[PDB]
Design a protein around this nucleic acid. Sequence first.
DNA 1: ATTCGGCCGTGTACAAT
RNA 2: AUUGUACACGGCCGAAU
DNA 3: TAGACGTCGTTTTAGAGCT
DNA 4: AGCTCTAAAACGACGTCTA
Lengths: 48, 188, 48, 144, 48, 468, 416, 35, 36, 51
Amino acid sequence: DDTVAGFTEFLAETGRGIESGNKQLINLNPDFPGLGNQNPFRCKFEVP
Amino acid sequence: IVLALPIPLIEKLVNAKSDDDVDGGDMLNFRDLLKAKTLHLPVPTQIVWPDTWDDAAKIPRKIKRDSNRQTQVKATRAWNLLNALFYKAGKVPWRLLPDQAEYRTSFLGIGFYRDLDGQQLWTSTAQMFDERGRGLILRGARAQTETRGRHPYLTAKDAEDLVVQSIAAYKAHHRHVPARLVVLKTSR
Amino acid sequence: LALTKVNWNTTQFDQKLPAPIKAAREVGRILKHVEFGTAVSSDFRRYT
Amino acid sequence: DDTVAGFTEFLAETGRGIESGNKQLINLNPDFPGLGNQNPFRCKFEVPDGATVTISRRQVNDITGIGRHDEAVRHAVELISSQLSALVEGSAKPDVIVLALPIPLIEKLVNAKSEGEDSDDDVDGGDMLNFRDLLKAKTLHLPV
Amino acid sequence: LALTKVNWNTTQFDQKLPAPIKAAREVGRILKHVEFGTAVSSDFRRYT
Amino acid sequence: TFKAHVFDEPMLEFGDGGQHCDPRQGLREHGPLQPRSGDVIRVGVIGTDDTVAGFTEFLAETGRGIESGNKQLINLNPDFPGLGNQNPFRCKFEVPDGATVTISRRQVNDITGIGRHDEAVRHAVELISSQLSALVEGSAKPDVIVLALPIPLIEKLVNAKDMLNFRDLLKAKTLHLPVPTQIVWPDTWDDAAKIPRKIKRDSNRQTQVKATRAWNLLNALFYKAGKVPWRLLPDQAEYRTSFLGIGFYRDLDGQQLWTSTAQMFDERGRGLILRGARAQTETRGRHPYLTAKDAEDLVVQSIAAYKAHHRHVPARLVVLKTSRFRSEEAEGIDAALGKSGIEMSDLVWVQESSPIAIFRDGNYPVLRGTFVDLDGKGLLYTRGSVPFYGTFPGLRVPRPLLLVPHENSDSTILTLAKDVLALTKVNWNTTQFDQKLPAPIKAAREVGRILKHVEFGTAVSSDFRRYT
Amino acid sequence: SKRITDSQVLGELGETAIKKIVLETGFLYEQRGRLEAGTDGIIELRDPKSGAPLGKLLGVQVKSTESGQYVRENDNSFEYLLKPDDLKYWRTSNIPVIIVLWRKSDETAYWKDVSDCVRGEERRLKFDKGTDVFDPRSADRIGALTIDRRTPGVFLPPLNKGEDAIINLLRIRLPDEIFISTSPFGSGRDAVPELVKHGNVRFDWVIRKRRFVSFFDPREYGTRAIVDLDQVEAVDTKLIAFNDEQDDLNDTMDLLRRTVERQTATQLSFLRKDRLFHFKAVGVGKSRSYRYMSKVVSAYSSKKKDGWGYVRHHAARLRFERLADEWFLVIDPDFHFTTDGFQPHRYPEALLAGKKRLERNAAVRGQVTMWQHLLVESGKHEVGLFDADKPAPLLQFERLPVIQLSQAVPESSWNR
Amino acid sequence: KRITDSQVLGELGETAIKKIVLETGFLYEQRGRLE
Amino acid sequence: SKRITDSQVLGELGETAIKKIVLETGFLYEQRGRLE
Amino acid sequence: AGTDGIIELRDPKSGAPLGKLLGVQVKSTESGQYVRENDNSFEYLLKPDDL
DNA sequence: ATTCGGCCGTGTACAAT
RNA sequence: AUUGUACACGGCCGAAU
DNA sequence: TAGACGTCGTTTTAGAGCT
DNA sequence: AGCTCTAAAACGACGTCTA
Ligand SMILES: [Ca+2]
Ligand SMILES: [Ca+2]
Ligand SMILES: [Ca+2]
Ligand SMILES: [Ca+2]
């Protein structure tokens, strides 16, 4: 129940967008856009 | 389905420390065994360790007991994980852009893997070809043949039955044999 | 070189090995535990 | 392609509703309502494009050309399983796959009579293979 | 008597046999051709 | 009962992915499917000096543009854009210096002096073919050669003062020259000139408006230059298909019947190969059908031609014939397919003499593309009222095509009708897209006219540029 | 207090009523808010076949009325005066604007393009009650205003709901009983002269391969000398009519045509060199007229002219086909020319070519309906109404259900 | 995109009902895009 | 001759601004037609 | 439909509506970042069906 | 001879209601 | 023969008596 | 009888007015 | 400097003069 709740928050966290881990190389380490118009998959990752 | 293993379970299954004496050193791999034993299930499964969805989590390495494993940044982990999740959901993320004037080609990769006894050698093959339209098929099959040995290469009959199987799989989607067949192999 | 960009297991495209060669090895790991003669799905989503 | 087109039209026909066969017993033999207020499943049964696989006339003639009925059933199962494998790994993966068997295939596999001289009818043997049971068993690994 | 009305293969509710008995016979037809020791799906949608 | 269906007009492709339902309009917006290299299509002209100069100005007259012959229907009778940015072919047609061969008045009077029409036709053919050779060998090197026949020659070669046809004979005797030809009468490039008819000497020849004439003539010139104007827009996921049209033509003596075939298939990438060919071995007879052995050879030759471009055998083979498919032909075709491992096959008889028809309330006929299933036999209206044209461009009543598939056909009649209807829009001999017959069937008949005079065993070009 | 007068609600009633008419046509309506400047709405064209919005708009001005008569109403047409300020605003628009008139008393709606001025009077429109009705039948006409006819390459997909078309086929209801026998006569033609001597001529009989078949019993209403009575055993028609043998198709077709000839012998004469059924002319130089339903329509089946003249008998090529194990009859309209009405004309080239050139789908469809009415009536019960010397006809013809077409020809928009 | 016949049917019904209310004497206000 | 005075435009702008404020709040706003 | 609103021109001086319409489609985002957005420019990808 | 099926070839009228 | 349709005429073929 | 011109109904804000 | 009517615009049909 710790990991199930923990991973579920992560899926919602990716929906909000994740800041890039290294701004020096923005192409090798890009930031996950989120649920905006830049959504890489045009879908929502949800746990029903 | 995402299998979020807890830290104590990872310690027992992977690092095997909670270890007993070594018997041959061919310890079972939990991930490969789990994937094989649930091949009859209709939904693909994904294994995710806690340190990827939580930067606070730390799992020590198996042999180097005093050091945690180093992972990519959180943004990169989200990119790779969600792309795999999308692919396993039943859709192809991207495809090679095809040249307009190109031969209808089918790619067949051939590889070998040690048997569980550690001595014999089996043949595992993968086939890549783009279906009619915007799509890409990646099949994974094992040569339905009985010629067991330690040779990291195929036999004359074994290769023929393997190529025939790959062609039939291609003909199921295109209804015509490929113009070109490129066979990539891990041995001479 | 073109085949290295369709592995689908990672979003980083500087993969060393072509996908059919790489996919064959990934199938091999799972199939060590599948007894010979057992029919299994050929979908690569079950092995990646 | 005759059966695929025929069955696809039937699914659309059920959407428009089918009158009851026996009006005298309207409960034992009701009428399919179709799309609307009384849609029994609240869903549309559609066959998306690219989700159909056609059995060629040569493929049917290949199965019918086999003398032994048991061999013909086994050969047909391998043929349909290959088509089923291609359908589930394609871009348009269906929710359920319908095998609309053509009339000649049913005659050869169920009735077990061949257009030419029949072999397995002459040699009955201990028992006979059932095409439906074998097909379901040989496609248990497929996800659909 | 209640178990006779959950035979989803038909919509006519008057059924001579309870579903667990009926379903156990249907899976027998399919598993007749499955080699022993081969893992198969337990979902009944594959047998009905 | 009988279930109807109205197919939407198939979409075409005009290069750079340009999609439109009208060839002439699609060419205006996007240009030809295969863009011509360079900017000038050199056109050679043969004829009397007035005819040569008259046609030379006509090509220039097309550059300035031709006003639409009927303002009421500008979709059926459109203007010719000219050399602007809306050029239908994105190229200019020129008669380069030195690419002109003149028929002298003595030469013309030599032809008309022969009493026998057949002897005069043969004498004219050898004279014209000799002048064709001079143009080809010379430094001019045109891409397409236009033969502008003078009025006195037309009055003699076509009208009297079975019998030989000058166009068919001329085309056959020039099959060995690299440059394709194109016969043009003075009525095409000059409204003033009038040609009397053959039987009725009083009546002149009614012709289309000049804008329509320029559209059809220049499209043929562009196609004969070596580039495909347009192509059917391929579907997203369709079987790699090859279309083989089989037709029959009367022998020169007028009794025996040969087999002429035309094959059309998509090239690898943007292209559309149309091949006209004759059966390699023909058994003597008057039969409008085929024999099991020769029907096998036609398919085998057809597969090899497809395999030369694609390096793979076609997934689906569609055979269109002008006569009912008989058991001998079907089993002969099946034998060839098994050798090459073709999965699916269709055998359709394109009947044009069927009396079944469909009528609607109003003064206009049924829409083009309307289809009705008749016990597995299709009633396709390849011609009819066209919404794009705003009318029905034709005489009394369109006659529908009856498609009678053989029992050895994989696809349904609904699918075959859609393919047959689409195949009517790739007849490059004209820009009007409401053609009654599919291109493989029509091209086979047009090939038969030229091959009537070509002696058996002679190796001739399979390119359709030489027969259209 | 605040009041919403009947004029205001009626004005909003018209806008809603027109929106209801537009929506059931298949288009999209767009009611403009408080800041409307002379257009009460926007109409967007939709493709009924695919449902894709075509993206072509046109302004709408709705002028309602509870009751009353418009300007110069005469139960056929009326006039409407446009306000000059409204006319000026509509001219500046880059989209066509149509004015729709709604009357509550008879719930009728009429439409007209505001640019369709009559007699040069810019601010006067002349409606027509028979063709300006606002309803789904006018969908193609509305969309035609959205494009400039002067520019090439503009067109609209058909917007009508659909049409209904006749099939030019007549279902044949064969009698369930057929009279077959193995007659001693070798060939059919050999037995024809032998029938004349015996008498009792019916001529609905076909014999080939030494086997005899007819719908009537040869033992009465016809001769018996051509057949052996003992072997005449009556059998069901389904055994031979719907039988797969090619020979059983040929005799059935020949038997069907000969049976048809007797049924229509009152008005139809069957030519032999050309397999053509033409209306027999009563009176050498007397033109005829045949009446058929649709409505009362009288077509000059036999027509004569002056000079040496001719008689243009309406003709048909009656042919029989088997579809889905059910026999159908095909009608092929044609014309037959005769000098005195009985012997064939000798140069019908110019007459046939001249006549066939003129008619269109409207005329050809009329001939199909005329023939369909005649063959259906010719086999009806009580056609002779005597029960003796005139038995009920063997063949029953019934019209097929009307063919349904999803798309319809925009004939109304094609007015020149 | 596309507009299904069911989508336009709903707007036809709401317009038909609004038409019915108007000569009844009342006032009808069709709501916005949000359901 | 047709004129849309600044008063009507200002009133429509005020209504639109109030609707925008309401939607920013999170509620739903329905605008009444001519018969308001 | 394809468009989300219609803009009608109007002369600011006299208030006269010119009658010229102008289709408008509005895409609304919440704290997003357009594709390759600098401090002075960005890009946008139109759906093929919208074109 | 018939009865059913069909096909290919050469001319005129017309540019579409 | 810019282009095809419609119509008219003519020739011929396949199956059985 | 047609045909603007008019009165009547509302919103919408803003001004000249009496206070 | 507040109210309050009063102007000014638009739309919605409908008598009323005005010929
Ligand atoms: Ca993975
Ligand atoms: Ca079942
Ligand atoms: Ca040509
Ligand atoms: Ca309004």
